[PDB]
Design a protein around this ligand. Structure first.
Ligand SMILES: [Mg+2]
Ligand SMILES: [Mg+2]
Ligand SMILES: [Mg+2]
Ligand SMILES: [Mg+2]
Ligand SMILES: [Mg+2]
Ligand SMILES: [Mg+2]
Ligand SMILES: [Mg+2]
Ligand SMILES: [Mg+2]
Ligand SMILES: [Mg+2]
Ligand SMILES: [Mg+2]
Ligand SMILES: [Mg+2]
Ligand SMILES: [Mg+2]
Ligand SMILES: [Mg+2]
Ligand SMILES: [Mg+2]
Ligand SMILES: [Mg+2]
Ligand SMILES: [Mg+2]
Ligand SMILES: [Mg+2]
Ligand SMILES: [Mg+2]
Ligand SMILES: [Mg+2]
Ligand SMILES: [Mg+2]
Ligand SMILES: [Mg+2]
Ligand SMILES: [Mg+2]
Ligand SMILES: [Mg+2]
Ligand SMILES: [Mg+2]
Ligand SMILES: [Mg+2]
Ligand SMILES: [Mg+2]
Ligand SMILES: [Mg+2]
Ligand SMILES: [Mg+2]
Ligand SMILES: [Mg+2]
Ligand SMILES: [Mg+2]
Ligand SMILES: [Mg+2]
Ligand SMILES: [Mg+2]
Ligand SMILES: [Mg+2]
Ligand SMILES: [Mg+2]
Ligand SMILES: [Mg+2]
Ligand SMILES: [Mg+2]
Ligand SMILES: [Mg+2]
Ligand SMILES: [Mg+2]
Ligand SMILES: [Mg+2]
Ligand SMILES: [Mg+2]
Ligand SMILES: [Mg+2]
Ligand SMILES: [Mg+2]
Ligand SMILES: [Mg+2]
Ligand SMILES: [Mg+2]
Ligand SMILES: [Mg+2]
Ligand SMILES: [Mg+2]
Ligand SMILES: [Mg+2]
Ligand SMILES: [Mg+2]
Ligand SMILES: [Mg+2]
Ligand SMILES: [Mg+2]
Ligand SMILES: [Mg+2]
Ligand SMILES: [Mg+2]
Ligand SMILES: [Mg+2]
Ligand SMILES: [Mg+2]
Ligand SMILES: [Mg+2]
Ligand SMILES: [Mg+2]
Ligand SMILES: [Mg+2]
Ligand SMILES: [Mg+2]
Ligand SMILES: [Mg+2]
Ligand SMILES: [Mg+2]
Ligand SMILES: [Mg+2]
Ligand SMILES: [Mg+2]
Ligand SMILES: [Mg+2]
Ligand SMILES: [Mg+2]
Ligand SMILES: [Mg+2]
Ligand SMILES: [Mg+2]
Ligand SMILES: [Mg+2]
Ligand SMILES: [Mg+2]
Ligand SMILES: [Mg+2]
Ligand SMILES: [Mg+2]
Ligand SMILES: [Mg+2]
Ligand SMILES: [Mg+2]
Ligand SMILES: [Mg+2]
Ligand SMILES: [Mg+2]
Ligand SMILES: [Mg+2]
Ligand SMILES: [Mg+2]
Ligand SMILES: [Mg+2]
Ligand SMILES: [Mg+2]
Ligand SMILES: [Mg+2]
Ligand SMILES: [Mg+2]
Ligand SMILES: [Mg+2]
Ligand SMILES: [Mg+2]
Ligand SMILES: [Mg+2]
Ligand SMILES: [Mg+2]
Ligand SMILES: [Mg+2]
Ligand SMILES: [Zn+2]
Lengths: 99, 138, 84, 100, 208, 125
RNA sequence: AUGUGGACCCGCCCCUUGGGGUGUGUCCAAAGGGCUUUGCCCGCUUCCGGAUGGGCCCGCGUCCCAUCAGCUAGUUGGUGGGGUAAUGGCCCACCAAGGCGACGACGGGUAGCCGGUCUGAGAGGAUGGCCGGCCACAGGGGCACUGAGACACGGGCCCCACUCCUACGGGAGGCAGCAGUUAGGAAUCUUCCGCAAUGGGCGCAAGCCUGACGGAGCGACGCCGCUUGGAGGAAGAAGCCCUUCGGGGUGUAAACUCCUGAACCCGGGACGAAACCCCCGACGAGGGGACUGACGGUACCGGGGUAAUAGCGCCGGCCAACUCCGUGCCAGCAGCCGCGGUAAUACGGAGGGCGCGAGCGUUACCCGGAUUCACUGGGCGUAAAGGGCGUGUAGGCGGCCUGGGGCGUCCCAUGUGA
């Protein structure tokens, strides 16, 4: 009394539970850098920010994030961290920043 | 007050011919003459001399009339049977070279002001222009 | 992708396909991108076919896609002969 | 081309924004009488320089905000609070038409 | 379909010979040389001044009743004719004569229009060598109208063609009596054929 | 009126009142009879015209004329409305179609049978 | 891991609204499967272009009621964020108090819009049904997921209503898809055939699905073509009508005599089909070969072959067509004017005539006539119509000459108007 393409949904769940979990990470992880770059720790932060940059740009191998999305993320990310550390902090590792 | 000078002249004429007279005047105007300039060259009238009325410059306009008919009402036929204003100040009428009139299947004339001076139903089509359609006469 | 196919015209029991370029997601008798000739699978006319090769191959240079049956005509129309 | 219009300013009570009042003459489609119209736009003025009476110009632009898709071009003749008069009266008189 | 029944009565309703019969409507009368007055109980009674309408109605029926064609097909032509430019009135009869069943009557293949229909209908008529059983068929310049082989006989055809000797054809036609072939040379202007019908009155009747 | 006035006011479009509303716009309307009587007509005329008060679908109830000579319409008779007034009978702008539902055509009708819902009779045998 | 390249931060360069480029830092990739395999093919991966399809925004145009005259708190602008492919007050904080409306806001009512369509001399008026473009919806609402793209008819979750199965111990469903049923209604169809053709998806390809589509089915619903026959045939039968009883009409109409002979009978029988595919040439080009028809043995062709459905409206005037009888303001007709009272061309029947013809009438609705909303193209002393009279706001309108500008206006050119 149906079609077998009900798969698509039956699949679409995995993809959902897949890039949902992938994304909950980016959020909590994009936080680390924010919190740190807010409080001096330029060194330890500018390694989470490189990572963040990873998970973000890495994500662009699927149907999770795409287009100017990862670009808009960083654009606001590795611009927000530089402003925070700008207040005191003093740079430590450009590992991700063409200062 | 004169909310419309052109019309005033046309009517100034219309009211004279109806009673048959040799000439009626009318306040001077650069634009007013270029209009009479058409009627002379089209023979709708005789001519006119920039006469003067008490310091004020007028335009003695001279009228033509048909031959003195006979029988009841010996009054002659009109050279200018009909004349009425088209593009009024309360409503301007603008037409292109393709939207030009057609007075009495040629038997009449139409006067319009264009970017190439004061022309005729014809000249407008010949020149290939168009502008404010002043009036019609026949 | 954009395709080149037949579009029924004329009437019932009387085809007069229009050959044209349009998106594959349009109805076969829908709004096409550019008309480039016709065809009468009945052979009841001297002009039972016609193509604008100059305009046809152009869509091929931009990456068109003819039907398996639209090929036939296109090939049997003298548009594929590479030549040299 | 990006639409370009000439209008005057009547408002600047918005942080960074001014209101420009435009006009356009065109014949009536049925009666042919040359008539006027009007349309108030919300002009974007970042460096709030222009004030009231400024007969200025504007250009079609990307969406600044809801209701605000017009940047200012140039001045055309400031110091014309006379046009802002007849506009101010109109809205002024709208308190005399009240069905009350 | 087409009209069927009393026709000599029409011959005399309009008050004019129209030769819808073969010999009779052509012999001593369409029943009229006997009684040249209108049918019905009120025949031998004086008439009332026919109104401008009734005149155009009568002058129309006349023409249509002549070619014996329904009001359907009929007006369709006038409109098609009227659609054109020039005179239409003249153009009208042009489209009337172009009918197949008409050409046959003229080309003497048949005596009456109603006989000419039976011919075309049954398939005993040709056109450039085609079986054309459609009386509605419109003919143009140079079209050849002959008889089919299965029919190039029949004791009725020879009679009709034979009678056609000692008679001429329109300035827009040409018959090979001895061969059973004819040709439509051109569209016959108003002149090319005179008739009891003032077209101009038929034009008026259609601008109600 | 000056042309200026016309740009202000504009020429108002007439509009037209329907003479047959009970119909709801369609050509006909199925209904049901309530009272069947005869009423003295109006004007210079005189008689006893056969009419019917009809309860129809659209919760309406209007008076309807019964054409011809003699009908078979009782109280709970079904019927169909036509449209078109009588005149002599003020306040009745609808005729009844014959030979439909509970309205039988006029018997022994030989002339205009299209109306009166009478079928073609037999000639000889 | 690799990075041709791409992504983002900063400086720099050009351009200049986040466009291109540069430098530096950091981040980012992959997929194999089948073989006339050892070389091709079917795919994978990142990038810069092409093409196609979109999203968003803007100018102008887009009905009725002012007997709806004032509307607004995310409301208007700002700042900064969140958000998306990205602009945006889209969303969220805070700042300021703005934003809209007689050029008709807000409100109620009606409506999917256009190409077109109908009418009209025209301008206009009316309309948006089939076909085509766009929008919106998929039992009523809300929502998000997947994905390049949906907030998704035949996908999912939740609420609601409705309905169905049940060993009731519990679950199911969404025809505004094709047909069909039911109710509503004046009323609108086959529960058909076929994937042969065309189009679509999947695939290397055979091949597969395709109520898209090609067809067939039902309905004079429409337009169109066609038939119920043709010639001859009387001073013109019978019958039925009138009649001044002399006669007139139906009427060549029939009969009748010849002629053909639609339908039906027999045989034949399609165009619609050619490719994909296969062989040769390398699967390129080319050439050659082969396959497949639903409609259906149907259209059409031959020959045989029978005179074979005619109905409807009207005949007072407008408006074409007249008499008898019946009836007697009764029964009845009627678009309007009006017909019927014992002589009715107006009711009812008959005879006859006019008008159409597989149609003829009726009702309803749109335009026309109506120039009767009048732009084209009208009026206001007495026919409907000058405000009871001023003052004045906005608004409309504006005198003679000359110059700048050239908005309106006008010409040319070009794009678009599928
Ligand atoms: Mg990848
Ligand atoms: Mg997604
Ligand atoms: Mg599409
Ligand atoms: Mg091929
Ligand atoms: Mg003409
Ligand atoms: Mg007419
Ligand atoms: Mg840049
Ligand atoms: Mg790998
Ligand atoms: Mg395998
Ligand atoms: Mg869309
Ligand atoms: Mg923002
Ligand atoms: Mg999205
Ligand atoms: Mg925003
Ligand atoms: Mg922003
Ligand atoms: Mg807020
Ligand atoms: Mg007011
Ligand atoms: Mg406005
Ligand atoms: Mg209004
Ligand atoms: Mg509403
Ligand atoms: Mg609606
Ligand atoms: Mg339209
Ligand atoms: Mg049309
Ligand atoms: Mg017309
Ligand atoms: Mg029009
Ligand atoms: Mg509309
Ligand atoms: Mg529909
Ligand atoms: Mg549609
Ligand atoms: Mg439903
Ligand atoms: Mg799309
Ligand atoms: Mg779906
Ligand atoms: Mg859904
Ligand atoms: Mg949707
Ligand atoms: Mg469904
Ligand atoms: Mg079901
Ligand atoms: Mg259905
Ligand atoms: Mg059904
Ligand atoms: Mg029912
Ligand atoms: Mg169907
Ligand atoms: Mg198929
Ligand atoms: Mg296929
Ligand atoms: Mg394949
Ligand atoms: Mg299936
Ligand atoms: Mg099927
Ligand atoms: Mg179909
Ligand atoms: Mg039929
Ligand atoms: Mg019917
Ligand atoms: Mg007799
Ligand atoms: Mg008799
Ligand atoms: Mg006969
Ligand atoms: Mg025989
Ligand atoms: Mg066989
Ligand atoms: Mg195949
Ligand atoms: Mg081959
Ligand atoms: Mg071959
Ligand atoms: Mg056969
Ligand atoms: Mg045969
Ligand atoms: Mg017979
Ligand atoms: Mg009639
Ligand atoms: Mg009539
Ligand atoms: Mg008469
Ligand atoms: Mg009476
Ligand atoms: Mg009385
Ligand atoms: Mg009657
Ligand atoms: Mg009597
Ligand atoms: Mg009397
Ligand atoms: Mg009558
Ligand atoms: Mg009678
Ligand atoms: Mg009769
Ligand atoms: Mg009669
Ligand atoms: Mg009808
Ligand atoms: Mg007309
Ligand atoms: Mg007027
Ligand atoms: Mg009047
Ligand atoms: Mg006055
Ligand atoms: Mg009075
Ligand atoms: Mg009065
Ligand atoms: Mg007064
Ligand atoms: Mg006053
Ligand atoms: Mg008062
Ligand atoms: Mg006053
Ligand atoms: Mg003033
Ligand atoms: Mg002024
Ligand atoms: Mg001036
Ligand atoms: Mg100047
Ligand atoms: Mg152009
Ligand atoms: Zn005769």
């Amino acid at each position: 009394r149906n079609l077998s393409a009900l798969k698509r949904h039956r699949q679409s769940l995995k993809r959902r539970l897949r890039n949902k979990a992938k994304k909950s990470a980016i959020k909590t992880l994009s936080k680390k850098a924010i919190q740190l770059a807010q409080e001096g720790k330029a060194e330890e932060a500018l390694k989470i920010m490189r990572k963040a940059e990873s998970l973000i740009d890495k994500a662009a191998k699927g149907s999770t994030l795409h287009k100017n999305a990862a670009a808009r993320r960083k654009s606001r990310l590795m611009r927000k961290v530089r402003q925070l550390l700008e207040a005191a902090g003093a740079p430590l590792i450009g590992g991700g920043l063409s200062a | 007050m004169l909310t419309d000078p052109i019309a005033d002249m046309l009517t100034r004429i219309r009211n004279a011919t109806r009673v048959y007279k040799e000439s009626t005047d009318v306040p001077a105007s650069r634009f007013k003459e270029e209009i009479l300039r058409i009627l002379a060259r089209e023979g709708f009238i005789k001519g006119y001399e920039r006469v003067d009325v008490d310091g004020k410059p007028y335009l003695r306009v001279y009228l033509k009339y048909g031959p003195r008919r006979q029988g009841p009402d010996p009054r002659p036929e009109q050279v200018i049977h009909h004349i009425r204003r088209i593009s009024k100040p309360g409503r301007r009428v603008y037409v292109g070279v393709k939207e030009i009139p057609r007075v009495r299947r040629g038997l009449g004339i139409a006067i319009l002001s264009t970017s190439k001076g004061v022309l005729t139903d014809r000249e407008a089509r010949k020149l290939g222009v168009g502008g404010e359609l002043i009036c019609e006469v026949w | 992708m954009v395709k080149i196919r037949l579009a029924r015209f004329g009437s019932k029991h009387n085809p007069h396909y229009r050959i044209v370029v349009t998106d594959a997601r349009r109805k076969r008798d829908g709004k096409y991108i550019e008309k480039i000739g016709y065809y009468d699978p009945r052979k009841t006319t001297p002009d039972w076919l016609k193509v604008d090769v100059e305009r046809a191959r152009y869509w091929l240079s931009v990456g068109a896609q003819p039907t398996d049956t639209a090929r036939r005509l296109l090939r049997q129309a003298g548009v594929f002969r590479q030549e040299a | 081309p990006k639409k370009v219009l000439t209008g005057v300013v009547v408002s600047d009570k918005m942080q960074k924004t001014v209101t420009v009042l435009v006009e356009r003459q065109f014949p009536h489609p049925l009666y042919g009488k040359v008539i006027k119209r009007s349309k108030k736009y919300l002009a974007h003025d970042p460096e709030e320089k222009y004030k009231l009476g400024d007969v200025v110009e504007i250009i079609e632009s990307r969406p600044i905000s809801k209701r605000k898709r017009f940047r200012v071009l140039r001045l055309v003749e400031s110091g014309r609070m006379d046009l802002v008069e007849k506009y101010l009266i109109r809205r002024q008189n709208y308190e005399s038409l009240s069905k009350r | 379909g087409r009209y069927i029944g009393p026709v000599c009565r029409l011959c005399r309703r309009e008050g004019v010979k129209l030769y819808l019969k073969g010999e009779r409507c052509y012999s001593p009368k369409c029943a009229m040389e006997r009684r040249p007055y209108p049918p019905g109980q009120h025949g031998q009674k004086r008439a009332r001044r026919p109104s401008d309408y009734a005149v155009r109605l009568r002058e129309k029926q006349k023409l249509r009743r002549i070619y014996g064609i329904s009001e359907r097909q009929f007006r369709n032509l006038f409109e098609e004719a009227s659609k054109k430019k020039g005179v239409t009135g003249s153009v009208f009869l042009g489209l009337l004569e172009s009918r197949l069943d008409n050409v046959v009557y003229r080309l003497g293949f048949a005596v009456s229009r109603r006989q000419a229909r039976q011919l075309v209908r049954h398939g005993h008529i040709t056109v450039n060598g085609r079986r054309v059983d459609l009386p509605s068929y419109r003919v143009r310049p140079g079209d050849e109208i002959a008889v089919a082989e299965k029919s190039r006989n029949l004791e009725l055809i020879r009679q009709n063609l034979e009678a056609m000797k000692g008679r001429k054809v329109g300035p827009w036609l040409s018959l090979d009596v001895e061969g059973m072939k004819g040709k439509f040379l051109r569209l016959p202007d108003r002149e090319d054929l005179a008739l009891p019908v003032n077209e101009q009155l038929v034009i008026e009747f259609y601008s109600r | 009126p000056t042309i200026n006035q016309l740009v202000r006011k504009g020429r108002e479009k007439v509009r037209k009142k329907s003479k047959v509303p009970a119909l709801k716009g369609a050509p006909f309307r199925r209904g049901v009879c309530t009272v069947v009587r005869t009423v003295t007509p109006k004007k210079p005329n005189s008689a006893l015209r056969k009419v019917a008060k009809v309860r129809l679908t659209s919760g309406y109830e209007v008076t309807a004329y019964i054409p011809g000579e003699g009908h078979n319409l009782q109280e709970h008779s079904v019927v169909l409305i036509r449209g078109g007034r009588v005149k002599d009978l003020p306040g009745v702008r609808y005729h009844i179609v014959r030979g439909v539902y509970d309205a039988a055509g006029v018997k022994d009708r030989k002339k205009s049978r299209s109306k009166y819902g009478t079928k073609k009779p037999k000639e000889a045998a």
